[PDB]
Design a protein around this ligand. Sequence first.
Ligand SMILES: O=C(O)c1ccccc1/C=N/OCc1ccccc1Cl
Ligand SMILES: O=C(O)c1ccccc1/C=N\OCc1ccccc1Cl
Lengths: 117, 117
Amino acid sequence: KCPLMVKVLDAVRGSPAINVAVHVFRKAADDTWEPFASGKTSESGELHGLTTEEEFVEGIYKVEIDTKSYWKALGISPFHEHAEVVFTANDSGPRRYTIAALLSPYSYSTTAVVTNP
Amino acid sequence: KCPLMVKVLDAVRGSPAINVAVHVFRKAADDTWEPFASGKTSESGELHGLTTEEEFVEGIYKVEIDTKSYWKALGISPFHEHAEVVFTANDSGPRRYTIAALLSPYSYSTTAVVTNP
Ligand SMILES: O=C(O)c1ccccc1/C=N/OCc1ccccc1Cl
Ligand SMILES: O=C(O)c1ccccc1/C=N\OCc1ccccc1Cl
């Protein structure tokens, strides 16, 4: 809710991208991707409540946005399997992260907004 | 000049992104990512010759663009560890895949151009 939020928009419809599955992973000491949190975007395109300040420790995180499943519910066969956002988090102390993604069938854009509480 | 080309642009400097490492992987039957091809973008930001028509069979591929090292070499603090483009390669008719990426320190945009020249 506070420390990690994901927002997804649809560049074809000019709308939030609703009901998009998002899976977050964190790299473990053995270099594997351990499951960290998951959820689905709301009617606003936003996904809150993935983690807490306590659990969102330093590490390398991967946010996987299940874009192919999204387009495959709207009649479009898209190019990408998903959109992946991989970043180191909290290495200089806690921050709040918003990961935004803008989706088209053959393209996506992503940006991050990082704030210090 | 092959079935798969990668082009990388720099949105801060308004230039090709030169000397960016690019690693391509193919998904194996056990769902792991197997190294497939790699190189570094040229002075034009392009990477040709990754694969051949013979070897680039249908399957799921991941193109990892090593953006963090690119920004670090410029003295710029970036957000992402790398940019990842994951897609299924499709044989329906003669097709050439160009993966293009536009890089900023906290953002990237990617698109696919799938043509038949
Ligand atoms: O693709 C090509 O053959 C090509 C050839 C010459 C010069 C540029 C490009 C791709 N540049 O495309 C721009 C772009 C790429 C990715 C995301 C957003 C944007 Cl605006
Ligand atoms: O809307 C919000 O509340 C928001 C807040 C913080 C960060 C991102 C966004 C979504 N918008 O930014 C994403 C975007 C806009 C235009 C072009 C490309 C892209 Cl990726």
